[PDB]
C-alpha cells in the first residue's frame, strides 16, 4: 500500500502519520531524516599555494661579458650586472677591475608545503541531493538507508520501498565559485587562471598540485649584488597566499544560512532546513491487519491534566476508554495542533491511558486518533518558564496559535460594536428616507 504525504525538511524531528488502508487497521508510520546532504558538482579550476623563489648559481664572467637568454620558467628573471669585483674566501675572484659581469637568474617554483598547504579553487554547479532516512512502521524496528532526494530513485528500507521527492526549494549555499582550504569553504570569486595579480590570492596558480606548468605573477626583480659579494639579491611581492590566509574572513561554514554544515569529502552542505520534502512509501501488505481482527475502542474521553506550550513535550493528557480484545492500538493526532510523543498504547477492556504532547497553541484543540476511533482533546496551556533551550521545537506555531480566548473576545467586541455603529447609522438613514418619501406621497 502506497502512502503519499509531504514532510518538512527538518533533521532530528520525526514525521508521524497513520497509513489507513481500506479494510485494515491503521498502521503507524514514522519517518525521520538522519541527515540531508546537498552534494554539488565541482570542477577543480586551479590550485594556489605559497611560492618558492629558486635562484641558481650566478655566472661570474671575469674579464669579459655574458648575455641573458629567455627560458621557459615561471616569472623568469635574468640580468647581467657589469662592473662587479667579487671577493671569495680566497681573495679577489676576478682579475680585471671593472670588465667583469655577474649574470643573476631567478624563477618561481611551488614550495614543498604546496603538497599539503594549498587552496583549491572550484567551479560549483548543481549536483545531487542525498539523505539518510530512518523509518519504522507497525511492529518493525527502525531501519535506515541512504536515498536520493530526487523523486525518482526508489530505496528499499526494511522491505518498504521509499521514494523521496525533490526538495521544494532549490536553494544551495555554494556560489558558482568557491575556494576550499583545509576543512573550510569560502565563497570567493577567484581570478581566472592566468589573471591572478601579484600579492593577491591568485599570484600563484597551477592547474593541479603535480602539474609541470606553473603560472606565477610576482614582481620578481633582480637587484645589483653588493660590492665585492657573490650573491643574487632580489625583491619580490610577499606571497598573496600568506596574505589571503591572514585576511580569509568568515568561512562558509560559519555564515551558511539555515544551519547548513559544510563537509569536504565530497564537498557538500548538510542539514539545510529549506522547504519541504514530498515522500511516497509502499508499506508491505503483510504489515496490515483486518479491522475485525483489531480491538474496538469506544467511549473515549480526553482530559488535559497539564500543559505548557514549551518546545519539549510539555503537555500531558489522560484518556479514559472502553474497549474489547485488550491489545496494542496506535495513537496519532492528524492535525498540527499537537505532536504526540507516544506512538501506541496498550488498551485493556476498560480503564484509561496517558500520553504526552507538544503544542504551540495557548488553547490547544486537537483530534486524537485511537486506531479505529478518535477523540477531541481541549485545554489551556501555561507559558514556558525557560527563556532559552538547547533543543529545537517539536511543534509548529500558526498565525492564530498565540491568540487567547480573551483576545478573541476583545476582537469580537471590537468588530461587533464597530459594525453595529455603522449598521445602525445606515438603518436610521434608510428609515428617514422612507419617511420623507411617504411625506411627499
Amino acid at each position: 500500500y502506497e502512502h503519499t504525504a509531504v514532510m518538512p525538511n527538518k533533521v532530528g524531528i520525526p514525521y508521524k502519520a497513520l497509513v489507513e488502508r481500506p479494510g485494515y487497521a491503521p498502521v503507524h508510520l514514522q519517518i525521520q531524516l538522519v541527515n540531508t546532504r546537498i552534494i554539488p558538482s565541482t570542477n577543480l579550476e586551479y590550485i594556489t599555494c605559497k611560492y618558492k623563489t629558486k635562484v641558481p648559481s650566478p655566472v661570474v664572467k671575469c674579464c669579459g661579458a655574458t648575455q641573458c637568454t629567455s627560458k621557459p620558467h615561471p616569472d623568469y628573471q635574468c640580468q647581467v650586472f657589469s662592473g662587479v669585483y667579487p671577493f671569495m674566501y680566497g681573495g679577489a675572484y676576478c682579475f680585471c677591475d671593472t670588465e667583469n659581469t655577474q649574470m643573476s637568474e631567478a624563477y618561481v617554483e611551488r614550495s614543498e608545503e604546496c603538497s599539503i598547504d594549498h587552496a583549491k579553487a572550484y567551479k560549483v554547479h548543481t549536483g545531487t541531493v542525498q539523505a539518510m532516512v530512518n523509518i519504522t512502521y507497525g511492529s518493525v524496528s527502525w531501519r535506515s538507508a541512504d536515498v536520493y532526494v530526487n523523486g525518482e530513485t526508489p530505496a528499499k528500507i526494511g522491505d518498504a520501498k521509499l521514494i523521496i521527492g525533490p526538495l521544494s526549494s532549490a536553494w544551495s549555499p555554494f556560489d558558482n565559485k568557491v575556494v576550499v582550504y583545509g576543512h573550510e569553504v569560502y565563497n570567493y570569486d577567484f581570478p581566472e587562471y592566468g589573471t591572478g595579480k601579484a600579492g593577491s590570492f591568485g599570484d600563484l596558480q597551477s592547474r593541479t598540485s603535480t602539474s609541470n606548468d606553473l603560472y606565477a605573477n610576482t614582481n620578481l626583480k633582480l637587484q645589483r649584488p653588493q660590492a665585492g659579494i657573490v650573491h643574487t639579491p632580489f625583491t619580490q611581492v610577499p606571497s598573496g597566499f600568506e596574505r589571503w590566509k591572514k585576511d580569509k574572513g568568515a568561512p562558509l561554514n560559519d555564515v551558511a544560512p539555515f544551519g547548513c554544515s559544510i563537509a569536504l569529502e565530497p564537498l557538500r552542505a548538510e542539514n539545510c532546513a529549506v522547504g519541504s520534502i514530498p515522500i511516497s512509501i509502499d508499506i508491505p501488505d503483510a504489515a496490515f491487519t483486518r479491522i475485525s481482527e483489531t480491538p474496538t475502542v469506544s467511549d473515549l474521553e480526553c482530559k488535559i491534566t497539564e500543559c505548557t506550550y514549551a518546545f519539549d513535550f510539555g503537555g500531558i493528557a489522560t484518556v479514559a476508554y472502553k474497549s474489547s480484545k485488550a491489545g496494542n492500538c496506535p495513537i496519532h493526532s492528524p492535525s498540527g495542533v499537537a505532536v504526540i510523543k507516544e506512538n501506541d498504547v496498550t488498551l485493556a477492556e476498560s480503564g484509561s491511558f496517558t500520553f504526552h504532547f507538544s503544542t504551540a497553541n495557548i488553547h490547544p484543540a486537537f483530534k486524537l486518533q485511537v486506531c479505529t476511533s478518535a477523540v477531541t482533546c481541549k485545554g489551556d496551556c501555561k507559558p514556558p518558564k525557560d527563556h532559552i533551550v538547547d533543543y529545537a521545537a517539536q511543534h509548529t506555531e500558526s498565525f492564530t496559535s498565540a491568540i487567547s480566548a480573551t483576545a478573541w473576545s476583545w476582537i469580537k467586541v471590537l468588530v461587533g460594536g464597530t459594525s453595529a455603529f455603522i449598521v445602525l447609522g445606515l438603518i436610521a438613514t434608510a428609515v428617514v428616507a422612507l419617511v420623507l418619501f411617504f411625506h411627499r406621497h
Partner: protein, 52 residues
C-alpha cells in the same frame, strides 16, 4: 600533515533572558567568537575576544 594540540578556552558563563543569550567570556588568549542565526538570514557575527 600532523595532529597538534590546540588550547581550549574556559567554558563561558551563560545567562538567559527573553529571546536573548548573554555570554560572559573569560579567555586566556585571543579567542575567536562566531555566531549565526539558523533562519533564512544567517546574520553572522565574528569578533576576537582578547579580554573578559
Amino acid at each position: 600533515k600532523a595532529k597538534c594540540i590546540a588550547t581550549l578556552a574556559p567554558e563561558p558563563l551563560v545567562e538567559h533572558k527573553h529571546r536573548t543569550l548573554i555570554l560572559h567570556l573569560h579567555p586566556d588568549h585571543p579567542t575567536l567568537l562566531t555566531t549565526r542565526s539558523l533562519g533564512s538570514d544567517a546574520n553572522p557575527t565574528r569578533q576576537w575576544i582578547e579580554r573578559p
